Design a protein around this ligand. Structure first.
Ligand code: TMP
Ligand code: MG
Length: 291
């Protein structure tokens, strides 16, 4: 049997579990299935990347562009102000999903309108990322390393920017063949200059939609009936809605902000909540027992 009490990673003060016996059972199920049955479905910004480091806020993939040298100061001020205004709505504990939804759509429209006007060149994304302050969570090498060693499918489902995200994991040496990225990917003109975004918008509250539009990916992993889902938002809880068959699913949520106001809700909807946690130690220990 699995005993969380015997696992010190689980007894750290940042680990909040509402139903420990159910988490035990779920983890026992993952262990029984092993590699052969495991897949990972994970958010990106503030789930695989850090929310803050040494007391300062770390950038999302969008923030990497907001802050980079390829954007004029005037634009950056506009972008900072949209961020202040729209982040406040995104995390607002008082507002329902349906109240927030149209403001999230609007944030993306305005942000992405301004980025297109700046004409970001594809060829500069590498430098922009290398000069950025982005940080992946502690333990990211062993997370991706262990998954790739056992050929475990990893689906990264991000409402961020796909090109930037890929470049971050590429520079960190963890963009392995088992990793699939679904995000908002830049459309470039004939000069390799940004003119728009491809496909349909993925935002904070419509991951259900793109989950169902990837049933090709999911129907090839029908045997991968044991799922570990990681997210930091309530909208991430929908990322596994396109999975073919679910036998055991464990949901791990990073609660990074408005902790006291959001804790009960997070504990009710995620199996394990990780409060102001900048490492992947908990999921790494699960992987260590499973693979
Ligand atoms: C549109 C926009 C979104 N974002 C955030 C909103 C979400 O929290 C996050 C989406 O990435 P995620 O789905 O990987 O967490 O990006 C910005 O930081 N800046 C922006 O301009
Ligand atoms: Mg996120």
């Amino acid at each position: 049997a699995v005993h969380l009490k015997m696992m010190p990673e689980f007894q750290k003060s940042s680990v909040r579990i509402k139903n420990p016996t159910r988490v035990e059972e779920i983890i026992c199920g993952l262990i029984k299935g092993g590699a052969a049955k495991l897949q990972i479905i994970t958010d990106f910004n503030m789930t695989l990347s850090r929310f803050s480091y040494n007391g300062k806020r770390c950038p999302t993939c969008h923030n990497i562009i907001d802050n980079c040298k390829l954007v004029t100061d005037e634009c950056r001020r506009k972008l900072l102000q949209l961020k202040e205004q729209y982040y406040a709505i995104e995390v607002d504990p008082v507002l329902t999903v349906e109240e927030k939804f149209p403001y999230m759509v609007e944030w993306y429209t305005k942000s992405h309108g301004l980025l297109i006007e700046q004409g970001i060149p594809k060829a500069k994304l590498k430098e922009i990322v290398a000069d950025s302050d982005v940080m992946l969570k502690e333990g990211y090498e062993n997370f991706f390393g262990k998954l790739q060693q056992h050929g475990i499918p990893v689906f990264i489902f991000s409402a961020g920017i796909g090109d930037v995200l890929e470049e971050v994991i590429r520079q960190a040496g963890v963009y392995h063949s088992n990793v699939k990225v679904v995000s908002n990917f830049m459309d470039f003109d004939e000069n390799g200059v940004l003119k728009g975004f491809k496909g349909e918008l993925i935002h904070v509250f419509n991951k259900h939609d793109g989950a169902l539009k990837n049933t090709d990916y999911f129907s090839q992993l029908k045997d991968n009936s044991n799922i570990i889902l990681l997210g930091d938002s309530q909208g991430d809880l929908r990322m596994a809605d396109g999975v073919a068959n679910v036998e055991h699913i464990l949901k791990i949520g990073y609660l990074n902000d408005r902790v006291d106001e959001l804790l009960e809700k997070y504990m009710d909807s995620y199996d394990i909540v990780l409060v102001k946690e900048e490492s992947l130690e908990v999921v790494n220990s699960i992987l260590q027992k499973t693979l």
